[PDB]
A paper describes a structure:
[name] is the rate-limiting enzyme of the salvage pathway and it has recently emerged as a target for anti-proliferative therapies for cancers where it is essential. Crystal structures of [name] in complex with masitinib and imatinib were solved and we were able to describe how [name] is activated by a conformational-dependent mechanism involving a dynamic functional pocket that partially overlaps the substrate binding site. We hypothesized that an increased level of interaction with [name] could trigger a switch from activation to inhibition; thus, in this work, we rationally design new masitinib derivatives to increase their binding site complementarity and [name] affinity to induce enzymatic inhibition. The mode of action of these probes is explored: we study [name] affinity for new compounds, solve the 3D crystal structures of the best derivatives in complex with [name], and evaluate the effect on [name] enzymatic activity.
As a proof of concept, we first rationally designed and synthesized two masitinib derivatives, named “[name]” and “dCKi2”, with minor modifications on the pyridine ring (ring A). As expected, [name] and dCKi2 displayed an increased binding affinity to [name]. The [name] thermal stabilization produced by these new compounds was greatly increased from 7.4 °C for masitinib to 14.3 and 17.3 °C for [name] and dCKi2, respectively. While masitinib is a modulator that only increases [name] enzymatic activity, its derivatives also induce a decrease in [name] enzymatic activity at high concentrations; therefore, [name] and dCKi2 are shifted from activators to inhibitors (in the micromolar range).
Numbering used by the authors:
A (entry chain A), B (entry chain A): 20 to 60, 71 to 164, 168 to 260
């Protein structure tokens, strides 16, 4: 049975960097990058996603619903493709997701509703769609939360240097940070997925640069995986 | 095995009337009304759908994508519920769909793209979603096409007397009519569903009032069902 583990964290916490570290450490370890992340850098999904990203910069209250539905669809399709296609010869197969359908809804879509970028009907339609489109083989064995300060993530947005992201304000990162803490640390966020309240969570502090010094983080991962 | 038959036709051709006739004629015959039809007349789907219908009257180029995705989702959910819930004691089970996921895409969503109510990205995202969300137990054994003139349907819009529909112009009904003829009569419409080109189609002329005189139409249905 493939173990499914989500990597969760704020914008520029280090999730993509961490996932591309893990992928290389075992042939029994595979990764599903976040579609939105891949859109940001030829396929019709990439063409659609690049357009949606640009349209979102111009007016989020017009495109948030369209963006969030396509982002989540794209993720489910990509996660199921890896789950059905990969690790068939693995001894102890693990698939690492760069975020989940839960971060799609409870972090991003939720935040856009709160920022008045979706109206009540768009948010209620989104939740209905999400509740339904998520009815199975994608349920998580575990979550790894990469915890960074908003300041760390703001500095890492600067380092990554996507022109379109240099305008992201600290306040927005602080809001996303608070949502992550409520969901994954305090476990105060109510979701419509009962099993989630029971899913084991590994919290890793990634404030210190780990690109060349990640053995302690991977040790924590291997320990966490052995408990599942 | 439940036989799945779609009832296809223009606005106010008589599909709802015909489906509510059929339902009563056999305990082995069940119907899935079109969600959009039900929205037009307490549940969160009805609340969402009524809002989406009203928002669409005000500006279709804003709401067409949201409307078409929720309409099609709502249909898949309702068709699968009947397929999983009903006719378990039937000898020769038949489920009649009021329209299909194909009329959703090739008639309505297509028409809205053509009427510049969806941009290329919205239409390409819609088709991608549709291709994907349709990957199974809903494939049709047969189609029944209720063929009425645009003039007949315009007269039947008047008879049904939905205030919001009295503005529908003959030209729009003529466009929908042409799409139906290309798909179901000439079979000239290319779809992304190969099996559809092979699905048996029964064409019924419903220009004459059938509310109290429908035996000949039902005879054609029973004959058609015996060939499948
Ligand atoms: C690409 C892009 C472009 C622009 C914006 N912008 C805003 O988030 C935003 C919101 C609100 C506002 C203020 N108000 C003014 C007043 N208006 C009436 C209402 C908006 C200004 C700007 C975000 C992005 N990226 C995003 N990615 C995600 C996402 N990332 C991964 C997974 C996932 N599911 N979702 C979500 S959002
Ligand atoms: C530059 C700027 C300045 C202001 C605001 N505003 C709001 O986001 C916003 C928040 C909340 C509300 C309602 N609240 C507050 C006011 N009230 C006191 C209580 C209700 C109203 C408006 C957004 C921006 N731009 C932003 N860019 C992004 C972004 N850009 C690319 C990728 C990405 N993921 N995200 C996100 S935010
Ligand atoms: C409820 C409602 C309200 C309004 C409208 N309006 C328009 O169709 C419409 C379009 C185009 C125009 C002209 N232009 C001006 C210029 N603009 C730039 C761009 C629009 C004006 C009006 C349609 C509806 N109903 C509808 N139901 C369906 C449907 N029914 C069953 C299954 C299904 N999948 N889909 C589709 S559409
Ligand atoms: C009253 C009126 C008047 C005009 C138009 N216009 C167009 O629909 C339309 C068509 C096509 C195009 C591009 N074409 C043409 C122009 N060029 C010559 C070649 C490209 C541009 C615009 C729409 C309306 N209203 C309408 N109501 C509905 C409706 N209302 C409730 C439920 C429902 N299902 N449908 C449908 S249509
Ligand atoms: O320990 C780290 C983690 C990340 N980064 C840099 O910070 C930016 C954001 O990282 P990533 O793209 O992995 O963040 P994600 O958005 O995927 O969490 C990138 O330029 C990384 O190279 C770094 O220098 N050291
Ligand atoms: O043979 C018929 C078929 C329909 N109608 C009336 O025409 C309108 C449209 O019918 P329906 O709602 O069944 O059309 P649909 O949109 O479902 O095809 C309704 O007022 C029907 O009662 C009728 O008088 N005789
Ligand atoms: Na690997
Ligand atoms: Na019946």
């Amino acid at each position: 049975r493939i173990k499914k583990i989500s990597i969760e964290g704020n914008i520029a916490a280090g999730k993509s960097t961490f996932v591309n570290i893990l992928k290389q450490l075992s042939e029994d370890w595979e990764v599903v990058p976040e579609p939105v992340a891949r859109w940001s850098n030829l396929t019709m999904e990439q063409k659609n996603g690049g357009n949606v990203l640009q349209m979102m910069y111009e007016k989020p209250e017009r495109w948030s619903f369209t963006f969030q539905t396509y982002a989540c669809l794209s993720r489910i399709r990509a996660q199921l493709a890896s789950l059905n296609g990969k690790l068939k010869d693995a001894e102890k197969p693990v698939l690492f997701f760069e975020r989940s359908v839960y971060s799609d809804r409870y972090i991003f879509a939720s935040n856009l509703y709160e920022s008045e970028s979706m109206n009540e009907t768009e948010w209620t339609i989104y939740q209905d769609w999400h509740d339904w489109m998520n009815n199975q083989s994608l349920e998580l064995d575990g979550i790894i939360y990469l915890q960074a300060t908003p300041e760390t993530c703001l500095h890492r947005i600067y380092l990554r240097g996507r022109n379109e992201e240099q305008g992201i304000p600290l306040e927005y990162l602080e809001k996303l940070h608070y949502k992550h803490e409520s969901w994954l640390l305090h476990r105060t966020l109510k979701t419509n997925f009962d099993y989630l309240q029971e899913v084991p969570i590994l919290t890793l502090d990634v404030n210190e640069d780990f690109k060349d010094k990640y053995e302690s983080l991977v040790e924590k991962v291997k320990e966490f995986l052995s408990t599942l």
